Structure formats: structure tokens, C-alpha cells
Design a protein around this ligand. Structure first.
Ligand SMILES: *[C@@H]1O[C@H](CO)[C@@H](O)[C@H](O)[C@H]1NC(C)=O
Lengths: 194, 225
């Protein structure tokens, strides 16, 4: 059967970037040209591989990570980037094999007066390692005195909501992002091209 | 509780300079820490920021010439000015950024450095003369919708800017209630309901954004008697 990309790409709601979702894709035929030929994606950039070669390759499994960020942050979903998303939310490795796919989701994820459902992590003492995921919510100690779980001065909740309103400039509008990565083990290959 | 700059001075070109900013109670390495500068008679310019995790970002006017760093054991932020030019002459403020990692709630007193020889924000009016008790409005307009990512500052002569309002309408703790902010998207207004004599100052709006860009601050409004 064809790989169920629609479950990922056409999901009703996406994950917040700090709690980004990973879906394993196995035991199916993947026609990657249905994706890269599409006029719907404003970003489709592959690293370590060419998109027109994907259909010729067999993998043990394929993985789809998905989340929502602001338009101006899509450039951080790339090897070697820095910033709040790359540093504290979703980190690709410096040498990456995979594809980054993104599209404007203003019509789905913004709301008159504001959609605040989507969050990102603002405060974190150190950068994420590649493919690390941090969903902790400890009060962030920004001063010399410990917080003991109490918000207050210099003691901050680490997550912050995006403010997605339809009148936002494009760089402040929500973008849905799918990162495809590929896995090759000494195991049967279960996702092949057509 | 405080940020204290040092290391400024008057230098001839062709050298190097290092500013330092020693913090208390604020922990430098846990915060979005920045340098903001102000040339004599001009507006504010965000120069560089150092993230808690160590990423650094610089305005295009100083990229390649300035470096920001920190010493965790001395709880100190530094600005290393390599090849300083006359156009770097300014008062240099150390700041901590809180809301969205770009709203500056604490400022050092600033240190003077003299060197011998994309969304745009428009603030109106540039000059505003009024009397005590007047109701005054200052408006900030952005070239694209920026939701509520805006803050307002008051700068008295000789002093560091002071945060009044952030998230467009949220009044900073300790600011009198006659100050209020309104608007969203592309138009934001600072209202002072009943002008008092201590309110005569220069006011700045700021598009609250994660990186030091050239249009971070409005050009300012000089409020005069
Ligand atoms: C998502 O929905 C559209 C419209 O029904 C469909 O044409 C498209 O193939 C779907 N995407 C995927 C990845 O299946």
C-alpha cells in the first residue's frame, strides 16, 4: 500500500514545535514525487540526498517530524542554524540527510483576535542536541535565587505562545513543517520507491 | 537588581576596546543579554544579543567588528569592539531582555564611547509640544502586521530608557496608570491621559523581535513643554 503521508501532512492540528511529533513510516511504497511536484509547499529542501533520487532508494524506515512555527523561523529548520527554534525547540544536525517541507497554514492555524494554542520554548540554559525533544515545564531560574516551582520575578514559565492572527505579516504567520528523515539498518527494507 | 557598565572612554581609531557589564541578582548566562547604543542626539540601536545557550546575533552595522561574550564566574557581559570607527561613538547600554527575549526591562546606566576620526517602524509625531494636564497620543506604525509584538519606552534626559508597556498594552509593574498602550497589527498608540511635568521625555516604540535589526526601534518622539 502507499505510505500514509496524508495522516501527517493533512492532520487537522499540528504539534507545538517544542513538543514536535514524530511519526514512523514503514511497510509501504513511497512516491516522493507526489510531494516534491506539488505547488502547495513553499519550502522543499533536501540535504544529503537529491529529491529526484528518493524514488530509487529503499530504506528500513522513514520518519516524519511535524510542528508549527512562524514564517520567519522556517529558515532555522536547516543544518547549521541558530536561533530560538534551532537552539531550544527543534535541532537538525550540522550534517543532515533528509528533507524539510513547509507551507503557509494561516488559513488553518490563525484566528481573528489570536490563536494561542501553539507554543515554543523561550527559556533554556543550553542548546538542544540534534533531534532532542524537551517537553519539561520547570520554572526557569533567571536570577540567583531558586524558584522552588513558584513563578515570580526572575522565575519564568519557559514556554510562550505564538500569536497567530490572520492580519499578521507573512513572517509572523503560522507555517506547518514536516521533516522527513531516513533510516538504514542491517534489517529488512520496508519503505521503497514505486 | 542592577547592571553596571564600565570600560568606556575616548580613544583614537586604529585600536580596540572592551566594554564590561557586571550584573547583580540577574544571572548573565541564564538571560538574553544585549548591548543597545545611542549616538549623541540620535535614537536607539540594538547592537548584539547573547542567548542563554550561547548563540550570538549582531546588527549589520557592527557584524564582523564587534563581539559579545560573557564570563560566568564574574557574572559579567562584555562587548569587544575591534577596529572601532568614529560612527561607533555612542552611549552603550547593557540590557536584559525578558518578554519574547527582546523586551528590555533592565538597563545599565550606560557608558560613553567616543572614537575620534524586513519590517519598518514609523513613529509620529517626531516632536510634540504640550502642557501639563494635556491628553497626548503617540502612534507607531509598522509596514506589516506584527500582532502585539511591540513595547514602549520612556527616556528622560541623561538617563537610560525605561520600559513602560510591552505586548502592546501590558503596563510594566510600577509605571503610573496614566500611561496606556493600545492597538495591534500595524498601528499602535501610546496615550498619556493627563500629562505631568515629570513625563516630559523622549518616547520610543520597539518592534519586539528576536534579532537586532536596523528597524528595531521607532525614531522617537520628543515630548516638550
Ligand atoms: C492532502 O489533501 C489533499 C486534498 O484532498 C490531497 O490532494 C493530498 O494528496 C493530501 N496530502 C497527502 C500527503 O496525501
Amino acid at each position: 500500500n502507499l505510505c500514509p503521508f496524508g495522516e501527517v501532512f493533512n492532520a487537522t492540528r499540528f504539534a507545538s514545535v517544542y513538543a514536535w511529533n514524530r511519526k514512523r513510516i514503514s511497510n509501504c511504497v513511497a512516491d516522493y514525487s507526489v510531494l516534491y511536484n506539488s505547488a502547495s509547499f513553499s519550502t522543499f529542501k533536501c540535504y544529503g540526498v537529491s529529491p529526484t533520487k528518493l524514488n530509487d532508494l529503499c530504506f528500513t524506515n522513514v520518519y516524519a517530524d511535524s510542528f508549527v512555527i512562524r514564517g520567519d523561523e522556517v529558515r532555522q529548520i536547516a543544518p547549521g542554524q541558530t536561533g530560538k527554534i534551532a537552539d531550544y525547540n527543534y535541532k537538525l544536525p550540522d550534517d543532515f540527510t533528509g528533507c524539510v517541507i513547509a507551507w503557509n497554514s494561516n488559513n488553518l492555524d490563525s484566528k481573528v483576535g489570536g490563536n494561542y494554542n501553539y507554543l515554543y520554548r523561550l527559556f533554556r540554559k543550553s542548546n538542544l542536541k540534534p533531534f532532542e525533544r524537551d517537553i519539561s515545564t520547570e520554572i526557569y531560574q533567571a536570577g540567583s535565587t531558586p524558584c522552588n516551582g513558584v513563578e515570580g520575578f526572575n522565575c519564568y514559565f519557559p514556554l510562550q505562545s505564538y500569536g497567530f492572527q490572520p492580519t499578521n505579516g507573512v513572517g509572523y504567520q503560522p507555517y506547518r513543517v514536516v521533516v522527513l528523515s531516513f533510516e538504514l539498518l542491517h534489517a529488512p527494507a520496508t519503505v521503497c520507491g514505486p | 537588581v542592577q547592571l553596571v557598565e564600565s570600560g568606556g572612554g575616548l580613544i583614537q581609531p586604529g585600536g580596540s576596546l572592551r566594554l564590561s557589564c557586571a550584573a547583580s541578582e540577574i544571572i548573565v548566562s541564564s538571560n538574553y543579554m544585549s548591548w543597545v547604543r545611542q549616538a549623541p542626539g540620535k535614537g536607539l540601536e540594538w547592537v548584539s544579543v547573547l542567548y542563554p545557550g550561547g548563540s550570538t546575533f549582531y546588527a549589520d552595522s557592527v557584524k564582523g567588528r564587534f563581539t559579545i561574550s560573557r564570563d560566568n564566574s564574574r557574572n559579567t557581559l562584555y562587548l569587544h569592539m575591534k577596529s572601532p570607527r568614529a560612527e561607533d561613538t555612542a552611549v552603550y547600554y547593557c540590557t536584559r531582555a525578558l518578554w519574547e527575549g527582546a523586551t528590555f526591562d533592565y538597563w545599565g546606566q550606560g557608558t560613553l564611547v567616543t572614537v575620534s576620526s524586513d519590517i519598518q517602524l514609523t513613529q509620529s509625531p517626531s516632536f510634540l509640544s504640550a502642557s501639563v494636564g494635556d491628553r497626548i497620543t503617540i502612534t507607531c506604525r509598522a509596514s506589516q502586521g506584527i500582532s502585539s509584538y511591540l513595547a514602549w519606552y520612556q527616556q528622560k534626559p541623561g538617563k537610560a530608557p525605561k520600559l513602560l508597556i510591552y505586548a502592546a498594552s501590558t503596563l510594566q509593574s510600577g509605571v503610573p496608570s496614566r500611561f496606556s498602550g493600545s492597538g495591534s497589527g500595524t498601528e499602535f498608540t501610546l496615550t498619556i491621559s493627563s500629562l505631568q511635568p515629570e513625563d516630559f521625555a523622549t518616547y520610543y516604540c520597539q518592534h519586539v523581535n528576536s534579532f537586532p535589526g536596523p528597524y528595531t526601534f521607532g525614531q522617537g518622539t520628543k515630548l516638550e513643554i
